[PDB]
Each structure stands twice: as structure tokens, then as C-alpha cells.
Description:
Order of helices and strands of chain A: EEEEE
Oligomer: homohexamer
CATH superfamily of chain A: Cysteine Protease (Bromelain) Inhibitor, subunit H
Site (Reactive bond for trypsin) (chains A, B, C, D, E, F): 13-14, 39-40
CATH architecture of chain A: Ribbon
Protein name (chains A, B, C, D, E, F): Bowman-Birk type proteinase inhibitor D-II
GO molecular function (chains A, B, C, D, E, F): serine-type endopeptidase inhibitor activity
Keywords (chains A, B, C, D, E, F): Disulfide bond, Protease inhibitor, Serine protease inhibitor
Family (chains A, B, C, D, E, F): Belongs to the Bowman-Birk serine protease inhibitor family.
Amino acid sequence: YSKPCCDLCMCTRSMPPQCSCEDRINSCHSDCKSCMCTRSQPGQCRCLDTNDFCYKPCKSR
Amino acid sequence: YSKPCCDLCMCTRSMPPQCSCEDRINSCHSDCKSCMCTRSQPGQCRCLDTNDFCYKPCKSR
Amino acid sequence: YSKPCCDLCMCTRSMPPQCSCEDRINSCHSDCKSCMCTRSQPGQCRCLDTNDFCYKPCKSR
Amino acid sequence: YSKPCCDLCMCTRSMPPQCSCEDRINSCHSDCKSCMCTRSQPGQCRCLDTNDFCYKPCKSR
Amino acid sequence: YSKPCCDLCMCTRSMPPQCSCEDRINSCHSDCKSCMCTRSQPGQCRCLDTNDFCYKPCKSR
Amino acid sequence: YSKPCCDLCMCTRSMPPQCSCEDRINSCHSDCKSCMCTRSQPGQCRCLDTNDFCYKPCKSR
């Protein structure tokens, strides 16, 4: 869907923590602020945004 | 969901083609025959099965 | 070009050795026997063939 | 050669875009400004520079 | 040391399971039967052997 | 152990150089200043710190 979730998240062991995510084809989630893709068809995209929290796992699988 | 789809697929340039896929947490799709995971909680899994076709992209994103 | 070379090669510490390679867009080298690509435009390909020798580095860079 | 090209490029979905590239043994292209390699022989290098455009694919393969 | 351990292990969800491991510079563990390295100095090696069990984590870190 | 070493190091071809490292389960070395891990059990961690030198290879293997 367009709603924000994340399956693989990583955080730094600092306080507050700094965390990020994974891969989608053509577009990133609606909440993403800087999105990076491959110059190809279909393009494989990732979110580069960093927060002090992780989104919840994608509810499907 | 439990239904079979695939976002990143790769095939050999032979006839018939030999193709495979990507990553899920704890479990693989219902149609998967040999599934491999990391000894960790939560475990990150992948399907090793090979077909002569690709499933369609996950309908959500 | 169409000529066979390899930049990143890996071999098993057995006798005779078993060795393979890396990445190209749309097509593999002319000598490649089983070539695998991504269902996308432009497709990113790799050779899965195994020999008991490595090709020489690509002469360009 | 020494001339600047790129096979795998990625860009952020922002305006202007922010883009980067891939892998070479011992040295990066002549136009590269910050180049990073592995402490090994032969060393495997990558360019970390970021532009608002992508170079064209390497003309050979 | 020369003793056999493994930090990152992966297994198939079949019975009995089929499992493997990770990365070392110049040589693999003493128990490894097919070891694969990069044609470079120092070479980065991995074990390709498959068992129906995982070794224990490296005791150091 | 808790002592600082590094097996895979990479540096930029600038003066002074800017260098970093690799992977551990649950914790980073004692000298690490910003450490990033996966939200999972056991978590896989990496050091993001950058210096103008590389640590020496882990003395064990």
C-alpha cells in the first residue's frame, strides 16, 4: 500500500538512536523525504531518511 | 499475505530459463519448497526454489 | 567489447579449483554458457559458469 | 580507459537529484574527487562523489 | 584460531535442514572441505560446505 | 575480545584518508563511538566511525 512500514531496520547504539530501512520497485513510502532509485525500468528504490524510531513490519507476510 | 508473488526476480539466458527471488521475516511463501533462514529472532528468510517462470510483483506497494 | 575478461574472480581451495565472476547491463560475455538477468529495463546480468581458471582483468580501466 | 562513465547509477527522488555509482581495481575515474579502496592487493575501489546527473554506461560491453 | 565456529548461519526450512556461513582473510577453518577465495592480496575467503547443523558463534567478541 | 581490530577496511584516495570497517553480533568494539544494529535477536552490528587510519586484522584466524 502507500502506508509507512519497514521489515529490515538498523539503529546506532547512541542516545537518541539514528535509524533507517529497505527496497521497493518505482516508488518509496508516502512518508519518505529523500528517495533514491536506479536509472532503469522498473527502477529499484530505497529510503535514505533517518529518524530516532523504526516503523512496524509490513503486515501482509 | 500467504499468496505467492516476487519483487526482484533473476533468470538465466538459456531455454527453458531457470529463475529465483528475495527476503521475508520468519517464513517464506506457501508455494516455496526449500526455505532458508538465519538462526536469530526475528529470522530473515529467502526462497531457493528455481522455476522456468517468475511470480508477479507484490500488489501492496 | 564482446571478448571475455573478469575483474572480481573467486576460487575454491580444492584441486582442480572451481572459479566464477561479476556484473554487466543486458548481456553476458560471448564465452558465457548460462547467463542470469533481472526482469527489468535495462537488465543487470551475471555469468554462473564455473571453470578451473580465471579470465584476465578488463583492459580499459 | 581513464574517461568517466557509470553502469549502475542511483538518484534521490528530490529536485535537484543527488546521484552516485560502482567498482574498479586499484584506481577510480580521472573525474572522481573522493575515491575509497580496500587495504589489499589488488585493491577494489568505488567513487563516493555525488552530482545532480549520471555519467553514460561504459561503452565496451 | 584454527578451531571451527560461525557468526552468521542460514538453514533451509526442510527436514533434515541444509546450513552454511561467512568471511575470513587468506584461509578458511580447519574443518572446511571446499573453500573459495578472491585472486588478490590479502584474499577474502568463505566456506561453501553444507551440514544439517550450525557451528557456535566465535568466542572472542 | 573487547580490544579493537578490523578485517575488511576501506579508505578514500584523499589526504588525510577517511577509513571504516565490518560485522559483529549484539555489540561493537569498546573504541567504537556510533554503533548500528538490526532490531532482532541476536542483532548484527557494524561501526560507522571514520578515522585517518585502519586498525590491524583480528588475531585469532
